[PDB]
């Protein structure tokens, strides 16, 4: 076949936290939560809380964001993987392209989106855990692909 | 890390390579492309479609994707299909379809997960069943394994 090239460092969570970054200091790399290798991204339950990366994209470009995941319970809200930018239009208009889970059995998810002529901002992917439930959540192999 | 695409030639940025022309009514030309130089375009006017064999792996999720227009009113649809027969007793067939008749381009996916054992080689269909003047346009067709 023919390679469709992965943006995202560390998708796979086997590198452990490495270019992750971590806003609620709630993430851990462990084996419980692998998909696929022997690590995935566990966002422990209880409160809102996930972490994400700054990726540039280029302009007028499609990509796929997909991933796969899980909760251990099943929670009140859901699990969102995003790509976030600011528009450079008069309001700076800001933008999420979101993907929501609430499984409990590994799922996977994705969308695609076509990115703007001009940034006014840099591109994030963040992975949200909204939900506040004591449930746990489990996502690896995270996606985000040129064409 | 990365996605492999299972279609060859999957934006026709080839031309007509690695994929069959059924009923000699296929051309790659610049305006049928979603993205790159080239798209597939079908011609109107008759049932029409083409294909290729794909290799794809047992217990395995996949997603099929596509882009798609037709150049004027269709009467009917345009469907991209992934086809196969299981292994079981009767080698038990499933189609995994997407069906277009947008005049504006659409992008389509689907989701599926293959079996233990295939009963047969899967087959990737582009078929043009309308049988309006409408030409159809189609672009970047993917199948990847996730
Ligand atoms: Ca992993
Ligand atoms: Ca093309």
Known sequence: ??????MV????????????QDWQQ????????????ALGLKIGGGKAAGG?????????????????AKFD?????????VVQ????????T?????????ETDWTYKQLLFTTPDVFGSTPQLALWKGDTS????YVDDVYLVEV
């Not at 709630?26 to 290798?37: F, R, T």
């Not at 800001?94 to 609430?102: A, D, G, M």
């Not at 004591?134 to 959540?137: E, F, Q, R, V």
């Open 9 to 20: 460092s560390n998708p796979g969570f086997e590198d452990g936290l490495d270019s992750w």
């Open 134 to 137: 004591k449930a746990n959540l």
């Open 26 to 37: 709630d993430m851990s790399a462990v084996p419980e939560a692998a998909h696929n290798g």
């Open 52 to 68: 994400g990366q700054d990726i540039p994209l280029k302009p007028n470009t499609t990509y796929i964001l997909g991933a796969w």
């Open 94 to 102: 800001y933008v999420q392209h979101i993907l929501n889970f609430n």
């Open 73 to 81: 319970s099943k929670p009140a809200g859901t699990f969102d993987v």
């Open 85 to 92: 930018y600011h528009l450079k239009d008069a309001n700076n």
């Open 1 to 6: 076949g023919s390679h469709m090239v992965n």
